[PDB]
Amino acid sequence: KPAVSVLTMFRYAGWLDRLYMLVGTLAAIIHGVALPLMMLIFGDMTDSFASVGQVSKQSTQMSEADKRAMFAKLEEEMTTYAYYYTGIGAGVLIVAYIQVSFWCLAAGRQIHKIRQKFFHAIMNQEIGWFDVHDVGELNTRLTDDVSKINEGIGDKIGMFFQAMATFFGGFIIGFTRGWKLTLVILAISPVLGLSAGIWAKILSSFTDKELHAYAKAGAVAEEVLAAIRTVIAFGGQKKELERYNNNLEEAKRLGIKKAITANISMGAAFLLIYASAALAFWYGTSLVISKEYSIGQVLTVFFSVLIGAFSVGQASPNIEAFANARGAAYEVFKIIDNKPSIDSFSKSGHKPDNIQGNLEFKNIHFSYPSRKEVQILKGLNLKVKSGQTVALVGNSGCGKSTTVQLMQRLYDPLDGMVSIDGQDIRTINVRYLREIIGVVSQEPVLFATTIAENIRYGREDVTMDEIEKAVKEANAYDFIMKLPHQFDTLVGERGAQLSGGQKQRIAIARALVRNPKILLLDEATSALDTESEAVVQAALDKAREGRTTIVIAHRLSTVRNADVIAGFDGGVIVEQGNHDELMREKGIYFKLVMTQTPPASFWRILKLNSTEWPYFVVGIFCAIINGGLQPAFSVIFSKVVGVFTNGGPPETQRQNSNLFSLLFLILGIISFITFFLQGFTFGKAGEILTKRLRYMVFKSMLRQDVSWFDDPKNTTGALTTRLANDAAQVKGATGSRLAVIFQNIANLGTGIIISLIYGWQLTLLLLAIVPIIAIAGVVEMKMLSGQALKDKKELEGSGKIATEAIENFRTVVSLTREQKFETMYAQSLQIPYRNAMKKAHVFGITFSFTQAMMYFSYAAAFRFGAYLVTQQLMTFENVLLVFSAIVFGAMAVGQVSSFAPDYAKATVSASHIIRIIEKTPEIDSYSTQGLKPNMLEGNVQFSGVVFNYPTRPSIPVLQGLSLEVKKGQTLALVGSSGCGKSTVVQLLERFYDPMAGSVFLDGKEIKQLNVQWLRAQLGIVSQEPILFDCSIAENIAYGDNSRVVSYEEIVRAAKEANIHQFIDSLPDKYNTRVGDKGTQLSGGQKQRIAIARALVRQPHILLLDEATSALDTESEKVVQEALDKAREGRTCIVIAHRLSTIQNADLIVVIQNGKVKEHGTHQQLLAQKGIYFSMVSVQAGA
């Protein structure tokens, strides 16, 4: 929404840049004007053939006499037009170079200036400007927004003025040569703009319906794949597939309905567009029979008008490129034009010599850019004598850290002044002030250069002698010399990461080369290992003694030797004095001392599509007919102009033109009929395999075992996305792109035959010219992408050192050396600059070549179409036919290169989708094999079970676990922590087979038992019961599948679960909808329902996995009261964390490291004193 003045945007263009644009926009207008004139000449060549075409047939008497006057007229005329034609091509060759080269030159020259001024402005902002802004967005604003500015002031402006030249020049020739066709052509424009307007209303409204349609099926997939362990436990995998299959059935009916309507729309709009044109041309014919406009003049206007009419559309993108570059330049120039109060690039203020370093802080009130929300310093008074070292202590707020901030004048205070020596700090030059102040901060930062270079960031003029004395004066010399490469080592986020105490020592040496008169040490010892802390502390003590120093830290070891200590309470300076005096004061300071002491040939996807042997042959045969039918319109056009140029006696002409225009409209309606078929057939054929694919995938997905659904690769969202994308992508490959790719190869094929079977030596020439200009059009795009990738790689190195400069900004400004990063960024940009200079010459040459290759190709089309061909016995009507036929059949092949990624993006989506079906699990619920015992009573035997989870085979959970529980008794399961308690329930459900050992139920190993039948005897109840969106009766009846459960039966379970108070209180009762879609209720009712569906199954084994986990107050007392009634009649395994409710259990087992540690009845493990006795004691006391 915000934008820039047009003149301010070009503020960096002067002298030559203004001229380049002037000559550039000039030649660009010359380039545009060249095309409608080329069409004006195409009319004069027609009249030459038309005057001879009328007189040649007018004879029917003399023959050799027509070998004289006609050929002579053709000789002087065709040579004149071909001479003019060759001139236009040389014109476009020059102006198209001038057009693109000059504009890309001005673009490259200015963007170089923009990028330097921009980065200079970034480093010029004061710190308070950075505290309110995001540096990451700022750096991306540097590389991206400048690119948008470059796209808008580049060769696009030349293309814009080239287009308006065609537009103006087209309608000028349109009006002057005959303004009775222009107004007729404009009259059909609203119809074409209205038909394409129905497309923007149909596409936008129906694209939501499909994203709405599958969102109902993908919702089924979501609540299923999220509750996968519940449907797996209750075996609803046929139902959840059936539901998904039932929603897929509706999505395909809405998909074929959209295929019917969208193809009716496309064919009707195409027929309206072609009938609109054929009327404007048949109207053109009605004005030639009236002897008002020559047969060649109708072409001259009809072409120049339609050329300039579409030149509007070809200019609209360049308008958006310029406007976007304007608005992109707003926030950029806003930074450049913004002037700071602090500067630091300013050359102003005093530079005191013989600085003795007497600092004082006077009544300083301050607040960080958070402003009126917080005021961290309410008044202040602090002096520090020269040579002394004052220490600042404080409980919190870190108002200590603020004084170091103000001392470098990173901010100016709200009220009060900071005084170095006697002068106010704001009277001293900012840079010189930062140069007389050395800074060592808590987190040290080293730029990605050598050690000597990082030390060289203290002062640019320095020799390795000073570097050596500095690092030796910080006792950092000894440890770096052992490091290889000596001072020439590397540092940074990338490469040679060092100890913290060593990086700080380099930072102390960096600040030591500064030879500052003022020293500021902010928590430099804090957040550092204890051993190396003394090593750095020795250097800090050796860094002072020649300077006045303010130091802030939470280490009260470094503070004793300070001449003065200062305490803060709420930004107010409270206590000050020597260490001993503050202890006698027994104030804040004393208080803090005591406190701290694979693309491949996949035909089988087409073999699955072979379910429909028809519907394809219908579409293909219908598409090839539509292919063979398109050039016949060019054939009709060739003979509407052909018989009119070849007319001779004019009486027969007027009756023939009516017959052709009629047949055209009969071919158009027969084109509409065949287009709707090839669309509908492919559409329906695409929508049905969408169901088959999503059905087989969702079926095979419900086949895999819990081992697969635990994969971090496969989450519920990543599966629904893999489910939607892979099915829609393969539809596009076998869909429109194929019907089109066959319609077009038939379009060229039926066009190339007619052209080859007509004009001799004529088609053979055009077949030498057209492929070369097509290839030359391709190679230009390749060099364009290569230059684009190359320039992306080069400015990346610049923005990389810009990223380092601005992300570590607060450090660089503290060391000044901003001019250093300026010079580095400038040297980095110099290569893309000289690169951008060559880009203009290349871009202009390629564009001018492809334009000249199109214009010269046109001269050879007529000079050969006349002369050798028309001096013989070859007619013009065919040359026109071969033109439209070949040129259109080629431009129809241009759609093959556009649908190419639709094929690759589908094969990759097919690659996954063929494997996701074929993958088979270790435990397949679909296998009908298995025992299915007849004996009801259930035992459970865990024997020697070692189990590790397939996702984390690192820490084992079960190591030699052994339980046994008889029928009708409760097996309590206590554990120190982890799924060691829970893994029992998962293995009994046989979510996994154990690594070693085995688990039995009736004495039969479940591993050889039937998987589905095994889980059919289990009454699983988990922590968070997930209930699908349907009737609570269905959530209850979900407990028994393969049979519809009686209402009184699901009532019995709801009576059993004590949930019946709700189920009758509701208005809908058992038919109420739950799942946070129709109604919402608390977890206690959710659990009771899960208990009901558990015992609707009438299991012989309950499995209660921390059922009271998420529950509170009386809700626990009523759900436990329901669970306690559900067991005692069945085999039961309870792992609940309420050991008070486990007291009445037939056997309590303590799990330890996967082994059973203690076991026995409650009082038995209470008689013993150990883990279970400690478990019952800790949470009974707490």
Ligand SMILES: Brc1ccc(Oc2c(Br)cc(Br)cc2Br)c(Br)c1
């Ligand atoms: Br835009 C444009 C349209 C037609 C051009 O040549 C013609 C011309 Br002029 C007339 C017919 Br019919 C077919 C072709 Br191809 C040229 Br060169 C450029």
Ligand SMILES: Brc1ccc(Oc2c(Br)cc(Br)cc2Br)c(Br)c1
């Ligand atoms: Br009659 C008649 C035939 C073709 C005409 O131009 C074309 C041409 Br040339 C090719 C195709 Br495809 C469609 C149309 Br409409 C015109 Br205008 C009038």
